[model samples]
Target chain A: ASGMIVTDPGADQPIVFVNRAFSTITGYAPNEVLGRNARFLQGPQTDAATVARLREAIAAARPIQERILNYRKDGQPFWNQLSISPVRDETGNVVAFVGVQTDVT
Target chain B: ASGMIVTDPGADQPIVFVNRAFSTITGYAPNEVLGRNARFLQGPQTDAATVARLREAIAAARPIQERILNYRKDGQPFWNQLSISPVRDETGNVVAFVGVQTDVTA
Candidate 1:
């Protein structure tokens, strides 16, 4: 199963919604992860280059696909294939971001 | 990859969001599928019993997991393992529904 998440860009990119797969993958409940940035998944083992790329793409409001190491709540590391795209409003303003994650570990 | 979709129950269960995997599975773009009921995926081959169960679950605001045949934009039939759960607000009012789909065609 793949994890799905939606974040509100207007609200400083805090996670607004997450699916059950996300809890199963990261061991974080909805109450625990909501209102937090997805960067919490990153740990000391995560690649700096990948994080930089993700940050750059997000700052540019562009879509990005990357596979990077991510950490679970229990400090377990796993490879995550992540895809993120901006959700735009009718006026073409980015209102939110949608992210899909697949555990490739 | 798995397909993910969100529908607004207050808006008569119209699709509000969809991910890229959904487009790949159903051959329908987000623009084309949004604001439409998921029932459009059904065809003659779709089982009435399964649809009935799905409708019952939705009406009762209960979660459901089922496998059924569904048609794509090209009218091709595929087996879909579907899971749907209600999204409730703080007051426990059903606001939306989340659906996840896996193409279990073997």
Candidate 2:
């Protein structure tokens, strides 16, 4: 499935919104993921280097495209190709992050 | 590289917007791909089923996620996991499509 997700840049980057495709891919309803960090989608099989790169991009307020192993609610693994871009406010500061998720596996 | 592309649903879905990452992935500059059908990215080995699904989704004005075979400008192939969604205007009419392409050759 393919979907868009938005999260706050502050306070652990809690998920603020997710689309229908996100629920179809992750097997979690919007209400379940709304207040949680998107990291829950990661699991033991996920690549450390990819995760590190994603963190670096986020910390620097830069955009990133990465493919990493991710798990669904049923514990099934899939390759998640994710893209994240910063949403800036009028002040030119990143106020939020928007992500697009697609399952490649 | 990560990028987004926007295509006009009218005018035969010609590419209207492409980001820098599109050039990096496909080896085609934005100027080269702009106003062209994205079908050029497919090659002889590209899966017919995947392309069919993509077309069906587009025809239905629905979103789709599929892994398809795609070729670069130099003719090298990669597995491109693509997602496309209809972009609707405030009137709830689908006017465009936004797509994301990611190479998962690793």
Candidate 3:
């Protein structure tokens, strides 16, 4: 199953919604994850270069797809296939970001 | 990439939201799909039994995952791994449904 998340860029990219698969994979309840940045899943072993790429993409409001190391609530590391796309309004302004993650571990 | 959709059960299961991947996979724009049932993607070749199962699951507000033939807006056929899960409210009432679809034609 793939986990899906939606974040509001206007609110510092805080998670606004998450599907059940996300809670299942991260071992975090929706209440615990909502209003937090998705970066909370990153850990020390996560690739810095990949993080940089993701940061650059989000900063530019562009779509990105990458595989990176992510940590669950229990501190267990897993390989995550992550894809993030910007959601734009009719005026072409980025309103939110939709993130899709799959546990490839 | 995977296609994702959200539907409102109260509104006759009409699509409420769709991701870009769904547009790419189904050849239908978000505007063209929203407010319509996901069944618009079905055609004559779609299996009645499979659809029946899907209907039963949704009627029972249960999660279901299955692979079935689904047609695109262009009328092309593809094998779709479709998973639908109910989204419940605070009282555990099913308010919406989240559907995930993967094109596994190969």
Candidate 4:
């Protein structure tokens, strides 16, 4: 309940750019996952439907706010809320998608 | 006119998050702002008072939608419409600020 995470819309790996009160909650350091793929925190039980929906949202250049089940690196499952929105250029061209993920456990 | 720039509220330089229809209009690319502050888009003649108002809004953590005159990297001065808003957590704590910058030279 005390941390925040943000990512670039087009970055394939989607490294996390912010984490506050994180170690106390997610047990990950700012550096441990700073530049690493955020999906690495997911496990076998992570909702594929949600991930698929996120992919589709990006492909469609729309914003998606979804909360689903996922797991941490320690195999501890938790509820995750992911919000993603597409950034468009002046001509309305989809340029990048910004994503923010939070652990609601 | 073309090009778009988005930024996180707490970023020191508030790098540009996106840019398109860009180089043709503003003479800048997303890469040019990948890790830069947006103030570079301003000119010596840009209204300093407006920039101060933007800073005040950010300091107050409120959303601001304003139109001001600014310059492109190519030295052409134009009007810019900017929107900056605060992103909050489920508990309603302001977590980050999201900024959307657009050029209206068209």
| RMSD of each predicted structure | 13.6, 15.4, 12.0, 5.1
Comparing candidate 1 with candidate 2, which one achieves the higher lDDT?
1
Residue ranges of candidate 4 with Cα displaced over 4 Å: A11-13, A21-24, A30-37, B1-44, B52-56, B59-62, B65-81, B101-106
Is candidate 1 or 2 superior in DockQ? 1
Per-residue CA lDDT of model 2 for A1-105, tens digit only, reads: 366676767678888667667788889898889879899999998999999999999989897889889999999998887888775432355546777777788
iRMS values for every prediction: 14.1, 13.5, 12.9, 4.0
The lDDT values for all models are 0.81, 0.78, 0.81, 0.64
**Model 4, residue A41: displacement in angstroms?**
2.3
TM-score comparison, 2 vs 4, better candidate: 4
* Pairs of residues at least 3 apart in sequence or in different chains that clash in candidate 4: A9-A97, B1-B106
After superposition, the stretches of candidate 1 with alpha carbons farther than 4 Å from their true spots are A1-105
Top-TM-score structure, candidate number: 4
Q: lDDT rank, highest first? A: 1, 3, 2, 4
Q: In order, what DockQ does each candidate have?
A: 0.04, 0.03, 0.04, 0.21
Worst 10 residues of 1 chain A by lDDT: A87-96
Error of 4 at B65 (Å): 4.1
TM-score of 3: 0.54
The positional error of residue B82 in candidate 3, measured at the CA in angstroms, is 0.1
Candidate 1 on B1-106: residue-level lDDT in tens? 6677888765469887786778998999999998899999999989999999999999899989889899999999999888877754333556467787878898
> For residue B40, what is the lDDT in candidate 2?
97
Number of residue pairs clashing in candidate 2, backbone atoms closer than 3 angstroms, sequence gap of 3 or more or interchain: 0
lDDT of 3 by residue, B36-95 (tens): 989988889889999999999998899898888999988999988888777553235564
